[PDB]
Amino acid sequence: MNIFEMLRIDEGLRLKIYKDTEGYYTIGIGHLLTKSPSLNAAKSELDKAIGRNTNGVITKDEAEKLFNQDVDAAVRGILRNAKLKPVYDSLDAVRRAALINAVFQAGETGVAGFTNSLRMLQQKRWDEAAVNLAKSRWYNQTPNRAKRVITTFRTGTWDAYKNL
Ligand SMILES: [Cl-]
Structure with missing residues (x-):
């Protein structure tokens, strides 16, 4: 297992525009095109990213x-x-993948409110970090995907993805 298969499992693959879990225009493998409710805005972003x-x-x-x-x-x-x-540098290879997965999910870096979680990760307080990560909108909105990532941070194994 690796980062690409991982996210590939978590994001799926769709070749036609679609709305994500948030109702955002996306395509491919979790590729957010735009946050605007405009399909036209999304096709344009799409043409521009694609070059055609x-x-x-x-x-x-x-x-x-x-x-x-x-x-x-x-x-x-x-x-x-x-x-x-x-944080990233303090982590092993598997946990590094979980950090990448989460940041990818955010479509942005160092998102709001996870200072404490980061700190616990950095200190290798796994179980505690897991619990803390879980008190989050993230976990409530996409609990299945969040559970897989959280399990990956807590264990340092690919167990949560081995069976998908
Ligand atoms: Cl989910």
């Missing part, structure tokens, strides 16, 4: 290109966030 006139649909290859660009962006945002970097 899509008409709202892409090929598998195109989806995977976006995905690669996106995972790369995430890692790099982490490396560049002053609060994320140290």
Whole structure:
């Protein structure tokens, strides 16, 4: 298992525009196009990201290109966030993947309210971190996906994804 299969399981793959769990225009593998309620705004963002006139649909290859660009962006945002970097560096390979997954899910770096969780992670207080991560809108809105990531932080294994 690795970061790409991981998120690939968590995000799914759709080749035609769709609305995420939040009602946002997205496509491919978790690729948020826009937060605007405008389909037109979404197709434009889509054409621009793709480099061609899509008409709202892409090929598998195109989806995977976006995905690669996106995972790369995430890692790099982490490396560049002053609060994320140290956490990320203190972690093992498996837990690092969970951090990437979560940041990817946010579509942004060092999201609001997880200072305490980060601190517990950094100190390797796994069980406590798990519990704390769970007191979050995140967990309540997408409990299944959040449970998988949380289990990954607490254990340092891929157990939560081995069976999907
Ligand atoms: Cl879920």
